[PDB]
Amino acid sequence: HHHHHHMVHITLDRNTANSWLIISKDRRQVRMGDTHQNVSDNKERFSNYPMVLGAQRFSSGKMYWEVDVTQKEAWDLGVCRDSVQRKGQFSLSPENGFWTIWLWQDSYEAGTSPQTTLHIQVPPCQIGIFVDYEAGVVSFYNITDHGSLIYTFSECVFAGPLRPFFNVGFNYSGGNAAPLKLCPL
Numbered sequence: 001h002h003h004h005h006h007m008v009h010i011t012l013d014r015n016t017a018n019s020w021l022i023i024s025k026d027r028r029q030v031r032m033g034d035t036h037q038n039v040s041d042n043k044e045r046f047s048n049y050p051m052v053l054g055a056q057r058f059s060s061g062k063m064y065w066e067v068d069v070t071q072k073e074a075w076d077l078g079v080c081r082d083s084v085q086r087k088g089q090f091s092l093s094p095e096n097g098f099w100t101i102w103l104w105q106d107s108y109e110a111g112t113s114p115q116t117t118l119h120i121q122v123p124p125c126q127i128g129i130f131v132d133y134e135a136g137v138v139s140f141y142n143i144t145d146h147g148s149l150i151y152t153f154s155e156c157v158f159a160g161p162l163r164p165f166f167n168v169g170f171n172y173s174g175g176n177a178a179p180l181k182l183c184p185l
């Protein structure tokens with residue numbers, strides 16, 4: 001792909017983070033803590049899952065960023081509406097305002113309803129995410145495999161401003177402690 005020139009500098013929004021997440025000083029890395037991180041509760045924080053939003057809001061244009069997922073067993077990545085539900089149980093689906101892929105139990109899937117199997121021969125260490133607001137497109141790329149396409153959501157109905165979306169996953173296994181990192185341009 002040739003989307004690299006739409007690169008945007010994404011930072012994480014502490015106020016949206018689940019209370020167990022640890023966001024780095026530069027707001028470019030996040031990992032699951034082993035305990036509550038001593039923050040107050042608020043209506044923005046994801047309560048049920050280890051999720052956080054980027055600070056940036058997009059309502060037009062073309063945007064590209066990359067995320068490092070090295071040595072994680074489980075994660076969700078993509079974009080979501082600014083107005084997604086924060087509290088309680090929900091599924092990641094376009095009907096609920098999410099355009100995401102994930103890793104879980106050694107398989108990769110797109111967050112359609114129901115979920116779609118992905119075909120990845122080279123497990124990615126970094127994921128590229130491209131959003132074309134006007135076209136209604138969200139695409140995912142395997143940076144480890146020379147930028148190969150993973151999945152395209154098309155005919156997207158964003159229905160509001162979009163925010164970068166992240167889930168570091170639980171760490172019940174002791175094998176999923178590694179961070180998500182926003183990679184440099």
Ligand SMILES: Cc1ccc(NC(=O)c2cccc(F)c2)cc1O
Nearest residue numbers: 040041042043044047048086087088
């Ligand atoms: C299911 C659910 C609903 C609501 C809340 N949190 C609050 O309403 C809240 C707002 C301001 C200060 C505060 F401490 C809490 C957490 C939840 O998990």
